[PDB]
Amino acid sequence: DPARSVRHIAIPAHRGLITDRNGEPLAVSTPVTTLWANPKELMTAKERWPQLAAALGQDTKLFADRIEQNAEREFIYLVRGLTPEQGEGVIALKVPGVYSIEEFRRFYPAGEVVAHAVGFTDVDDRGREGIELAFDEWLAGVPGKRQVLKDRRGRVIKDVQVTKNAKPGKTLALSIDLRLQYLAHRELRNALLENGAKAGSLVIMDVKTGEILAMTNQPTYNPNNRRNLQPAAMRNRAMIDVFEPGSTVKPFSMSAALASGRWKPSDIVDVYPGTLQIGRYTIRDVSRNSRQLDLTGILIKSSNVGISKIAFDIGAESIYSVMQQVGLGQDTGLGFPGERVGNLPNHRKWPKAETATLAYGYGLSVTAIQLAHAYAALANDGKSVPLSMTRVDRVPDGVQVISPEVASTVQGMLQQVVEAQGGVFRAQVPGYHAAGKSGTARKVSAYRSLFAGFAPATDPRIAMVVVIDELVSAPVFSKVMAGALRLMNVPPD
């Protein structure tokens, strides 16, 4: 084998800073020192091994066994990602065959608060979850290249030159407002622990800009210390958990009804006696104490019979079309690794049973982020704006999916659902008028308490979805919406 050889070594690049929308750091590259060895050289310095092993935190005999059994090799890793102080301590022992590579490891200043949205990096500093993965190319920059000269035994004689300078990765500003994310995380956690629930999610969207202002899942984990990590904790529920949304999509059924030409808010439907036979199927209402209900009352009572009679009159195709246009069961475009689409089934012929189940929310499956995006469109006077996990400076045109008149009418109906006698009084937001709808969701692979809404009711700014695994969602909406509006200096209405 030749006396000399020109070899190349990679120069790790500084990964891009992740910040919240206000510039607060969320993921920061921290210098670390990796140590590599030429075992052919180390084998000449055995009396040094126990001191070296101790400095590396490795067992004396396991360290020796590792070097001995790799005696034939010219490269092995000794240890990855020491502090620079520790790395300079080991280099200062001048053990033959021991070399250093400057690397970077991530630190997550907000820890468990934003764990799922930001994600984390693997041992090689590559994005594994969350934004770290979705924006990996943006963040990772480009490794450089070093030429070294080695002899027949693999000793590094000298560093010849850099042939490729490393290019640092680029700064990324998320849509997330860490102040709202802290509020959302605290209030969801407190609601689960006081209600003895094990899991849930909360999404906050800016209805004007499509920005995700907060996204919290419980349980969560500390990305800075993933020893002891339960896989349950790493699940990005808001983007992956698929469920039948139930009564929360009745506002879309009503939007279709108001767009049909055949219905106005003061219209009456007879829902007595709380049941409706359709062939061999029976539609049953949760509360069966009504005869005549106007369209707002059909929403306040969450009458399945009422919404089903409307759906039979207008046809399933109209309802399907609104649900598809507001994004339900559709790709979000966010590029998160696990993200699920759910299912909005289509038919050429819609029998009565399938028309009814679509209209009252059991004929489709969605995620919490899809449901929030649909509420954002309704809140934004019927105009859909693409979802963003990054700070939006220039707002996209977006698509008018519901007429502004119909969206305004449905906003006022959802204001009544929260405020009116018989309504969801526990969702009322201190200092503001709010609008929204509760539902009982059915998991698709179990039940979830849902609350979906927006505020302020008369000029909406924020949409929110609360999901609690096996009502209890409404007071979380109340507390988090109040705080979110005040943090965004939204004038109390």
Structure notes:
This protein is α+β, with helices and mostly antiparallel strands and 493 residues long. It folds into three domains: 2-175, no CATH class; 176-222 and 418-493, 2-Layer Sandwich (Beta-Lactamase), CATH 3.30.450; 236-417, 3-Layer(aba) Sandwich (Beta-lactamase), CATH 3.40.710.10. Helices cover 32% and strands 25% of the residues. The protein contains 18 helices and 20 strands. The chain has helices at residues 39-42, 49-56, 60-69, 84-91, 115-118, 130-134, 136-140, 178-195, 231-234, 237-240, 250-259, 295-301, 304-314, 316-325, 352-359, 368-379, 404-419, 473-487; strands at residues 4-11, 18-19, 25-37, 76-82, 98-107, 144-151, 156-164, 172-173, 200-206, 212-218, 242-244, 268-270, 275-278, 281-284, 292-294, 383-384, 399-400, 435-444, 447-455, 462-469. It has a six-stranded antiparallel sheet with strand order 10-9-20-19-18-11, sandwiched between helices. Strand 2 and strand 3 form a beta hairpin. Helix 2 crosses helix 3 and helix 13 crosses helix 15. The longest helix is centred in the middle third of the chain and has 18 residues, at 178-195. It is elongated and about 95 Å long. The termini are far apart.
